């Protein structure tokens, strides 16, 4: 469960991302594809090379979904229900892969927001991304 301090920390850290939201999402995806090449197979219709407009556009979608989760942090199963259906049913994304993308999002935030990425905020962000991941893997049937 996310504590009051966790929600405060996540809101503050994500608040600093700003107009870079889409950019950081794209960077996290690139980090994931390079570090964990098994994840690439979900995107055969994507060119995954650096500077790919498709990865850039998809990073904005990922960031917008995370922003929605932050904005509705007390109601995340409902807020992310459509995305949960998509990832579990249609796409059949292996649950392990959410841990991989979550780690790459943490790395991306650490690389860009050194003042925000304190040990406490690192912990809050990890719990938040794990909570998001729990919702997105909740619909395997």
């Amino acid at each position: 469960v996310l504590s009051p301090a966790d929600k405060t920390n996540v809101k503050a850290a994500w608040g600093k991302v700003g107009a870079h939201a889409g950019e950081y999402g794209a960077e996290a995806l690139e980090r994931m594809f390079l570090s964990f090449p098994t994840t690439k197979t979900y995107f055969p219709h994507f060119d995954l090379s650096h500077g790919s407009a498709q990865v850039k556009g998809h990073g904005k979608k990922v960031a917008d979904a995370l922003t929605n989760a932050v904005a509705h942090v007390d109601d995340m199963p409902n807020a992310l229900s459509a995305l949960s259906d998509l990832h579990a049913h249609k796409l059949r994304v292996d649950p392990v892969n959410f841990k991989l993308l979550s780690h790459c999002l943490l790395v991306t935030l650490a690389a860009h927001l050194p003042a925000e990425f304190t040990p406490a905020v690192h912990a809050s962000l990890d719990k938040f991304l794990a909570s998001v991941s729990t919702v997105l893997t909740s619909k395997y049937r």
């Binding site: 960077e27 390079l34 790395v107 650490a110 690389a111 860009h112 040990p119 912990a123």
Partner: protein, 146 residues
């Protein structure tokens, strides 16, 4: 594990800039804060009640230096990680019984600490090279379970 020459270069170049007195403690401290069940193995370290308490704990900084030393040692023997970590494998697996998933977690926390310290210099390809390394180290430390 096999790194390309480009990856080896990226890894060794960054590691030379690492503060070896601090980075290990930051990684071990963050492990204890982010994954609090790991505190079970460090009861004798004293005050772990708050993140500040953990990060400022002299025993955490001291033990972190030894951990980082072991990673440094692995970086010098990428083609023989099993031999390099044999004694530590026996310690962590046979004596301590630490679940090997936590070896993976500490490696990923180290990668976060490197990203924190180096910023844009910790590029996606540099990260990918370090992920190979910390995976290799975790697998080697887990050998006594295999």
């Amino acid at each position: 594990v096999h790194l390309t020459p480009k990856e080896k270069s990226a890894v060794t170049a960054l590691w030379g800039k690492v503060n070896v007195d601090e980075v290990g403690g930051e990684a071990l401290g963050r492990l204890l804060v982010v994954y609090p069940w790991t505190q079970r193995f460090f009861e004798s370290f004293g005050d772990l009640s708050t993140p500040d308490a953990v990060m400022g704990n002299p025993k955490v900084k001291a033990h972190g230096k030894k951990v980082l030393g072991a990673f440094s040692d692995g970086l010098a023997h990428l083609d023989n990680l099993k031999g390099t970590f044999a004694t530590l494998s026996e310690l962590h697996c046979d004596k301590l019984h630490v679940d090997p998933e936590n070896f993976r977690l500490l490696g990923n926390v180290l990668v976060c600490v490197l990203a924190h310290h180096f910023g844009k210099e910790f590029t996606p390809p540099v990260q990918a090279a370090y992920q190979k390394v910390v995976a290799g180290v975790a697998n080697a430390l887990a050998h006594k379970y295999h």
